[PDB]
Amino acid sequence: SFSGYLKLTDNVYIKNADIVEEAKKVKPTVVVNAANVYLKHGGGVAGALNKATNNAMQVESDDYIATNGPLKVGGSCVLSGHNLAKHCLHVVGPNVNKGEDIQLLKSAYENFNQHEVLLAPLLSAGIFGADPIHSLRVCVDTVRTNVYLAVFDKNLYDKLVSSFL
Incomplete structure (x- = not known):
């Protein structure tokens, strides 16, 4: 299953990873x-x-x-x-x-929420232009199912973890 993730909440996990490589590894x-x-x-x-x-x-x-x-x-x-x-x-x-x-x-x-477990990116982050810190906040406050977030950029991953409330 999923490995190397940092647990943010009861159901939200995060890792600095390429979501394509992560998907091929986990399927x-x-x-x-x-x-x-x-x-x-x-x-x-x-x-x-x-x-x-x-x-x-x-x-x-x-x-x-x-x-x-x-x-x-x-x-x-x-x-x-x-x-x-x-x-x-x-x-x-x-x-x-x-x-x-x-x-x-x-x-x-x-x-x-319609899926018990998902591998996902931060929605609206990257080329979609939203603040990824805001996207992670909306994710943890909205998603109740098990979400494994893959954040491609190490620098953004570190900023997301270090600023997580």
Whole structure:
């Protein structure tokens, strides 16, 4: 199962790790993708997860969008985890760089509560533009299921742990 995580709360764990490498090592039931409404996995966590699937995630995602239309900001969908996990929970956090309401970050994290355990990134962090310290706070105050957070950047990981209330 999950190794080398620091326990933040009863249900939130954190580790300085590449979520792709973590997913290949663990092969969790659920890996969370930092998705956009179109499921266009171009960069950040989404681009990295998709590249690890040899673009199979993008092919599956385009078929999902052709059938269902775009997701809502704050929403999610469950698709295959391909070679990374049993399932991928594609969750759309608000992208601050697109002027999206940061209040939707709590709605985005609520999607995690439908899964008993997840490997996840911090929603709306990185190229989505939100403050990762705020994202971790919303995560611990919203998610009740077991969430294993992978933070790619060591410097951000240290700042997140050292500032955690």
